RNA sequence: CGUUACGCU
């Protein structure tokens, strides 16, 4: 079975609880170091209709998902909207995500879809 | 090992 990174942070990382208002940035000193490291599993949402897989995590996004941007399709899109027009408005949208990708290929997952398998 | 393409994001 697995664990919710989500759960997996607010209890060993940081002490407290996320909310739709907590923000990463400031607990970042430790966070990451903690996070890098670690292997989880990204469960795409149900309306992607895609298998779960699993990715080392390579630390923390220097934005959260609502900032954070890349290129799809040609068009700038936010993690955010990007999971919100593939039918999944994100639970935390102010979250940093965890960054999978390499130097040259940024691959940022939400954590609320993430998980540790135990 | 390299380069495209396509995903992923």
Do not use: W
Request: glycine share 4%; with cysteine; net charge positive.
């Amino acid at each position: 079975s697995s664990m919710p990174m989500i759960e997996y942070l607010e209890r060993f990382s940081l002490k407290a609880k996320i909310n739709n208002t907590t923000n990463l940035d400031y607990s970042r000193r430790f966070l990451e170091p903690f996070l890098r490291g670690i292997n989880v599993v990204y469960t795409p949402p149900q309306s992607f209709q895609s298998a779960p897989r699993v990715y080392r995590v390579n630390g923390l996004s220097r934005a959260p998902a609502s900032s954070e941007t890349f290129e799809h399709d040609g068009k700038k899109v936010t993690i955010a909207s990007y999971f919100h027009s593939r039918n999944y408005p994100l639970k935390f949208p102010q979250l940093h995500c965890l960054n999978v990708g390499s130097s040259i290929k940024s691959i940022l997952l939400p954590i609320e879809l993430c998980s540790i398998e135990e």
